Design an enzyme around this catalytic site. Structure first.
Site, mmCIF file in Angstrom:
data_model
loop_
_atom_site.group_PDB
_atom_site.id
_atom_site.type_symbol
_atom_site.label_atom_id
_atom_site.label_comp_id
_atom_site.label_asym_id
_atom_site.label_seq_id
_atom_site.Cartn_x
_atom_site.Cartn_y
_atom_site.Cartn_z
ATOM 1 N N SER A 1 27.564 -26.710 -34.991
ATOM 2 C CA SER A 1 27.105 -27.301 -35.533
ATOM 3 C C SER A 1 27.553 -28.957 -35.840
ATOM 4 O O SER A 1 27.131 -29.678 -36.494
ATOM 5 C CB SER A 1 27.572 -26.296 -37.153
ATOM 6 N N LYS B 1 24.749 -31.008 -36.011
ATOM 7 C CA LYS B 1 24.097 -31.514 -36.516
ATOM 8 C C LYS B 1 24.127 -32.809 -37.200
ATOM 9 O O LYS B 1 23.843 -33.345 -38.123
ATOM 10 C CB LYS B 1 24.705 -30.550 -38.682
ATOM 11 N N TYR C 1 22.654 -23.497 -46.076
ATOM 12 C CA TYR C 1 23.192 -23.650 -44.873
ATOM 13 C C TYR C 1 22.336 -22.709 -43.681
ATOM 14 O O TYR C 1 21.930 -21.401 -43.579
ATOM 15 C CB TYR C 1 24.926 -23.574 -44.541
ATOM 16 N N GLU D 1 30.446 -33.137 -45.086
ATOM 17 C CA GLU D 1 30.968 -32.540 -46.300
ATOM 18 C C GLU D 1 31.749 -34.316 -46.739
ATOM 19 O O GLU D 1 32.586 -34.668 -46.375
ATOM 20 C CB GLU D 1 31.334 -31.605 -46.169
ATOM 21 N N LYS E 1 33.460 -32.311 -40.638
ATOM 22 C CA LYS E 1 32.839 -30.773 -40.664
ATOM 23 C C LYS E 1 33.652 -29.970 -39.977
ATOM 24 O O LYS E 1 33.951 -30.166 -38.811
ATOM 25 C CB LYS E 1 32.047 -31.985 -39.888
ATOM 26 N N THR E 2 32.765 -28.593 -39.623
ATOM 27 C CA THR E 2 33.653 -28.048 -38.555
ATOM 28 C C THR E 2 32.165 -27.524 -37.113
ATOM 29 O O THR E 2 30.977 -28.058 -38.255
ATOM 30 C CB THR E 2 33.935 -26.283 -39.716
ATOM 31 N N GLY E 3 32.795 -26.703 -36.460
ATOM 32 C CA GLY E 3 31.673 -26.447 -35.473
ATOM 33 C C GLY E 3 31.761 -24.978 -34.981
ATOM 34 O O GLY E 3 33.482 -25.044 -34.601
ATOM 35 N N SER E 4 31.186 -23.832 -34.298
ATOM 36 C CA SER E 4 31.586 -23.430 -33.556
ATOM 37 C C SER E 4 30.552 -22.853 -33.079
ATOM 38 O O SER E 4 29.208 -22.273 -32.987
ATOM 39 C CB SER E 4 31.773 -21.906 -34.405
HETATM 40 B B1 LIG Z 1 27.779 -23.929 -36.708
HETATM 41 O O1 LIG Z 1 28.051 -24.145 -35.863
HETATM 42 C C1 LIG Z 1 27.192 -22.948 -36.470
HETATM 43 N N1 LIG Z 1 27.234 -21.961 -36.597
HETATM 44 S S1 LIG Z 1 26.837 -20.293 -36.391
HETATM 45 O O2 LIG Z 1 27.271 -19.574 -37.297
HETATM 46 O O3 LIG Z 1 25.146 -20.223 -36.880
HETATM 47 C C2 LIG Z 1 26.477 -20.236 -34.389
HETATM 48 C C3 LIG Z 1 27.495 -19.146 -33.742
HETATM 49 C C4 LIG Z 1 28.857 -19.001 -33.930
HETATM 50 F F1 LIG Z 1 29.117 -18.029 -34.473
HETATM 51 F F2 LIG Z 1 30.272 -19.096 -33.136
HETATM 52 F F3 LIG Z 1 28.954 -19.798 -35.069
HETATM 53 C C5 LIG Z 1 27.281 -19.792 -32.181
HETATM 54 C C6 LIG Z 1 26.424 -19.754 -31.712
HETATM 55 C C7 LIG Z 1 26.255 -19.673 -30.588
HETATM 56 N N2 LIG Z 1 24.772 -19.629 -29.255
HETATM 57 N N3 LIG Z 1 24.843 -19.434 -28.596
HETATM 58 N N4 LIG Z 1 26.580 -19.327 -28.364
HETATM 59 N N5 LIG Z 1 26.652 -19.297 -28.979
HETATM 60 C C8 LIG Z 1 25.228 -19.974 -32.058
HETATM 61 C C9 LIG Z 1 25.652 -20.373 -33.878
HETATM 62 O O4 LIG Z 1 28.126 -24.157 -37.848
HETATM 63 P P1 LIG Z 1 29.859 -23.422 -38.255
HETATM 64 O O5 LIG Z 1 30.779 -24.624 -38.089
HETATM 65 O O6 LIG Z 1 29.849 -23.409 -40.009
HETATM 66 O O7 LIG Z 1 29.603 -22.446 -37.792
#
Ligand SMILES: *[B@]([O])([C][N]S(=O)(=O)C1=C(C(F)(F)F)[C]=C(C2=NN=N[N]2)[C]=[C]1)OP([O])([O])=O
Length: 353
Positions: free
Chosen positions: A59, A62, A145, A267, A307-310
């Site tokens: 994320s 974003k 979100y 943020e 900002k975090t992402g995952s």
């Molecule tokens: B974002 O990075 C969006 N996070 S998510 O929760 O929608 C999301 C994830 C994970 F659960 F890891 F966060 C994983 C994937 C993914 N798709 N294909 N492989 N992995 C998509 C979306 O914001 P934050 O930091 O708040 O989670």
């Protein structure tokens, strides 16, 4: 001089603690970059993390979508008071053509969750999703979100610029930011540099295709590139006029949800901020549930941003403070708790200031 020793003290233990194969930490201070690398981009290949390692930003993508929107608003192509219908012809006069570009960007449509449901996938059935979209909560009042929300915004930004989203970032936004190795799609000549992510079973993985993935969580970059992006956020006066504006647009707080001001992607907080303030920003409650927005009351004098992402296999955190001319980037190829990301950065940027 102490920068490397601080990162070692605060980021390096996290590799053992969470069995993280690989981590890249970057600090930028007074226009000097520091890069610190640990471990492996690929366990099976014993290939080490270095300046060419490509990680998935999740994320933090974003922030690029937000920036692309600011660029489009300042080239006259869009307005944040507009609605989707003006650009996505097939949605005009549908109830989604009632929600405006800003509200999509900042998660306030009233009726969008974190994900499209699993059954939505093709270009055709994303169009059908938003056609059949019907309101729930009062348009503009509730922060939800949302990958579908910002995705729609990106897709719209792309429509306004005539080119598909992936081309907006790679042909327009990334070059204007001086970024040489940031991608929506990693080309063949760069696959050797793309890390494996590692899931919670330490199995090697990369991101799965999904509906409007590019604008919501679909960017991949290197540590030098992310340090350039932070540089740009700290010192945009030096950049082309239009990307300067795009970047300044992303820093404007739009509303508050208690102590987190929501900007376009970023943020925003009052600086200095307490550690706990920085954590609450990424609580279950903010992240997972709808929450009621309040107008900005105290306009902070000195601001910081984060900002975090995952993705399933990768962790990213990004923070900068303009008036201290300082920022940090952390990139990992296994997720660690957002709170550990936020905390180590807190201790490093304080210790230097
Ligand atoms: B974002 O990075 C969006 N996070 S998510 O929760 O929608 C999301 C994830 C994970 F659960 F890891 F966060 C994983 C994937 C993914 N798709 N294909 N492989 N992995 C998509 C979306 O914001 P934050 O930091 O708040 O989670």
């Amino acid at each position: 001089q102490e920068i490397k020793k601080l990162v070692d003290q605060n980021f390096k233990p996290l590799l053992e603690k969470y069995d993280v194969p690989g981590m890249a930490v970057g600090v930028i201070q007074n226009n000097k970059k520091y890069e610190m690398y640990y471990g492996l981009q690929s366990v099976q290949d014993k290939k080490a993390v270095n300046s060419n390692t490509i990680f998935e930003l999740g994320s933090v993508s974003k922030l690029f979508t937000a920036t692309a929107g600011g660029y489009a608003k300042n080239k006259g192509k869009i307005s944040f008071d507009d609605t989707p219908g003006k650009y996505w012809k097939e949605l005009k006069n549908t109830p989604i053509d009632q929600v405006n570009l800003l509200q999509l960007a900042t998660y306030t449509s009233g009726n969008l969750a974190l994900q499209f449901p699993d059954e939505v996938q093709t270009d055709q059935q994303v169009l059908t999703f938003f056609k059949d979209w019907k309101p729930k909560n009062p348009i503009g009042e509730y922060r939800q979100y949302s990958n579908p929300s910002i995705g729609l915004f990106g897709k719209v930004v792309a429509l306004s610029m005539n080119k598909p989203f992936d081309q907006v970032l790679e042909k327009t936004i990334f070059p204007a930011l001086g970024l040489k190795h940031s991608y929506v799609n990693v080309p063949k000549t760069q696959m050797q540099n793309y890390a494996f992510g590692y899931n919670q079973e330490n199995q090697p993985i990369r991101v799965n295709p999904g509906p409007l993935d590019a604008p919501a969580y679909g960017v991949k970059s290197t540590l030098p590139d992310m340090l350039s992006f932070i540089h740009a956020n700290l010192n945009p006066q030096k950049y082309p006029t239009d990307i300067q504006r795009a970047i300044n647009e992303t820093h404007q707080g739009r509303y508050q949800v208690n102590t987190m001001y929501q900007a376009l992607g970023w943020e925003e907080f009052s600086y200095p901020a307490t550690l706990q303030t920085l954590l609450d920003s990424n609580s279950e409650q903010i992240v997972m549930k709808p929450n009621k927005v309040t107008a900005i009351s105290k306009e902070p004098s000195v601001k910081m941003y984060h900002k975090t992402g995952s993705t399933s296999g990768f962790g990213t955190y990004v923070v900068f403070i303009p008036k201290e001319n300082i920022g940090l980037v952390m990139l990992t190829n296994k997720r660690i708790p957002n709170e550990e990301r936020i905390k180590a950065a807190y201790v490093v940027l304080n210790a230097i200031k």
